[PDB]
Design a protein around this ligand. Sequence first.
Ligand code: CA
Ligand code: CA
Length: 341
Amino acid sequence: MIVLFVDFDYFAAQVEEVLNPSLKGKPVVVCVFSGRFEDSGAVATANYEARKFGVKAGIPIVEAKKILPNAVYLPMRKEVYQQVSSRIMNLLREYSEKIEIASIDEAYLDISDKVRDYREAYNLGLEIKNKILEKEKITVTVGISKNKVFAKIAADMAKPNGIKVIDDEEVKRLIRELDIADVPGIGNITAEKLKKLGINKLVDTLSIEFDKLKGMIGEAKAKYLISLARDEYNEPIRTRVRKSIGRIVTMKRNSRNLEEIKPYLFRAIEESYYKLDKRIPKAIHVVAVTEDLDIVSRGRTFPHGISKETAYSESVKLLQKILEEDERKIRRIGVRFSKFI
DNA sequence: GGGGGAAGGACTC
DNA sequence: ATGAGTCCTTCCCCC
Ligand SMILES: [Ca+2]
Ligand SMILES: [Ca+2]
């Protein structure tokens, strides 16, 4: 198989640059302001100018300003980035019918029936980077290899404004040499579990007893990693259909008082129904983030679609249950809708 | 034994 | 110490 992965460069920040070019060359930081206090919230994405100094997605906004007090700080404009992303995704469809939109700035293309080798594959990547640059003035990084996983790794290695092929021989190299923490789907919690087994490379998963591996990291992740180490990983490029839509908002102050929470919960439903646009959910889940950043949820499935008014009443009931069955204060509250008709 | 739903968990970006 | 969404695991009802 030949997979060509497109990863939009520091997307939200770069979009802000396209709309206001004077930002070029400067450290740009797109943030989500939580509104609890002055500058509360976190960084959603920074351009490379900002990243060079350790201003990155995830850190508090306050911290970022300590490091870069004179950087441009901008609020998330999600809807804008989405409209821009949609137009780019529409460009990529010109190069394959087999295309998987993984997120707002990631797309996988099965180009097996378009190019005969990696030479032709790498050229088509150039053609794609150019096209996106011509039409939208956005840079992207293209990663190419025999499966989705290594294509992503190609792009991890080449970003930003890059392009890389990981040919058959280098896959073998990487199975032996690549730090297993850098495998897509291996986070700190799992990396830690693995290192605690001597496993630092994909190849190591082939010499450990399977039950030992499964026993610690679960059956799926084990099968996953072994298949990669065997050079047998296969997952076809599939059109993804969204499976849920939801909104979760930060409360101005923590609480377990139902009337205090209701208004935030209700705003989350309003926004969610806006987002659903024509899709009718059969399942609603209420999601709370506790004071200690734990996540608790209660949901219910219906043998029919959920109307906004049913969402409103059921959500209160589900929030109650959360309050009855857990004593902590809530920091964040929201809703998630799924099981579309 | 395992299918399917609910809730918690990890990870992605 | 934000926000959105996906897949997996555990535990339990049930066949
Ligand atoms: Ca990106
Ligand atoms: Ca990792």
